[PDB]
Structure 1
Amino acid sequence: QPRLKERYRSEIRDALRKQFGYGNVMQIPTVTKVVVNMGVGEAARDAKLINGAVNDLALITGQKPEVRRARKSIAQFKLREGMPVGVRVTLRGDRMWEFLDRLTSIALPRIRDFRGLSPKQFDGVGNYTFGLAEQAVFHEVDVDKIDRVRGMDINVVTSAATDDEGRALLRALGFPFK
């Protein structure tokens, strides 16, 4: 039993019924999936992302990601239709809560000169998205087994209906906001 999931249905599940006037317990917001992709656009030349962007998100998240192909061909990028350009993993269930636990506790507050994450980054539904700068804090990867740096951006998808409804869900989970 992961510790953030049991803490979710201990006080977070109850605190939102007082802050927001829900009549039913089925209206309570909950994060459903967390999506992490690299998006290695420097893979249209020499095609070296198999060792790079696959063997690290397998170490960060816990399951091997999906090599994604291009939809159409754009000439200014040397990008042909049917060429690996992005690498995406999807986290559900126990591995979702154990990724957000390892993110907020030890990974996210060790960015160099970290002053929070912007609370203006909600889409209009209640789904949150931020980015990272480099092959990040995540201690499962080391310098002995990495190539060049690459960044990721992380989608957090909740069942909330509006922005502050989903912002208040992520406050109790442990996302910092400035």
Structure 2
Amino acid sequence: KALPRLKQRYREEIREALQQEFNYANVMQIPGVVKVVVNMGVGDAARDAKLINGAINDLALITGQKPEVRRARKSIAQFKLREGMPIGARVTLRGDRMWEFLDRLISIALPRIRDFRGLSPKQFDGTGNYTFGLNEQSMFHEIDVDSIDRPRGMDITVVTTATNDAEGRALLRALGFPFKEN
């Protein structure tokens, strides 16, 4: 009935491209994306919790599902951080919602970064997943720039069924990732 284009792209072109270049023994070893999770660490909530309420709504409008406020599980005195206080918010994306986020970030959002220069291809994790962080939330279209109070950044990491880095880098770069070339 309905089909996201990037998933339509992955199923049709990307899936065969990976198979041809990596010559898999079986079809099920084709690497796909599993989920994309976005978290933002406040850290300044150790003093004033008002920032946490501001951080929650930013992610909710960014993605499409309200964050899960993350209590702090350690009491560190130097941070003036106590047990159980909210310190970060995280959003998990599965199903069609990754592609819509993944496409909207690739095509529109990522070019909108101030003096955008690309992302290093060595930001992998060794197991075949990518992580990379940001510094501002005003970049997104869905957040009104007047409504912002302070640039709070946010981290995006993608999890793929790839095992090694080459398989992962093949998936994301062929998916349209503006990788830097070292």
Q: TM-score, normalised by structure 1?
A: 0.97
1:53-64 equivalence runs, <5 A: 53-64=55-66
Mapped contact 1:32–1:158 kept (Cα < 8 A): yes
Please state whether the residue corresponding to 1:38 is helix, strand or coil. Answer: strand
Number of residue-to-residue matches in the alignment: 178
Equivalences for residues 67-146 of structure 1 within 5 A = 67-146=69-148
**Is residue 21 from structure 1 mapped to residue 23 from structure 2 by the alignment?**
yes
Per the TM alignment, residue 90 of structure 1 is displaced from its structure 2 partner at its CA by 0.5
On the 8 A contact 2:52/2:88 being kept in 1, the answer is no
1:48 to 47, 50, 55: 50
Q: Structure 1 CA distance, aligned partners of 2:139 and 2:149?
A: 15
- Partners of 1:52 and 1:19 in 2: how far apart? 46
Aligned CA-pair RMSD: 1.0
Q: Which amino acid aligns with 2:7?
A: K
The correspondence for 1:155, drawn from 154, 157, 173, is 157
Note if 1:65 corresponds to 2:67: yes
Q: TM-score, normalized by length of structure 2?
A: 0.95
Q: Deviations over 1:53-82 (max 9, x none)?
A: 111111000000100011111111110011
Are 1:31 and 1:157, in contact at CA under 8 Å, matched by a contact in 2? Answer: yes
Check 1:136–1:20 CA distance in 2 against 1; reply closer, same or farther (3 A cut): farther
Which stretch of the first structure deviates more once superposed, 140-149 or 161-170?
140-149
Unaligned runs of 5+ in 2: none
1:47 Cα shift? 0.6
Q: SS in structure 1 opposite 2:78?
A: helix
Question: What SS class does the counterpart of residue 164 from structure 1 fall into?
Answer: helix
Tell me the equivalent position of 1:36. Answer: 38
Quick one: distance in 2 between partners of 1:147 and 1:112? 18
Instruction: Report deviation, 1:50.
Output: 4.1
**Structure 1 residue runs of 4+, over 4 Å off?**
none
Give the distance between the partners of 1:45 and 1:125, measured in 2 at CA: 37
**Code of the aligned partner of 1:109:** P
Equivalent AA in structure 2 for residue 26 of structure 1:
M
Aligned partner of residue 148 in structure 1, secondary structure: coil
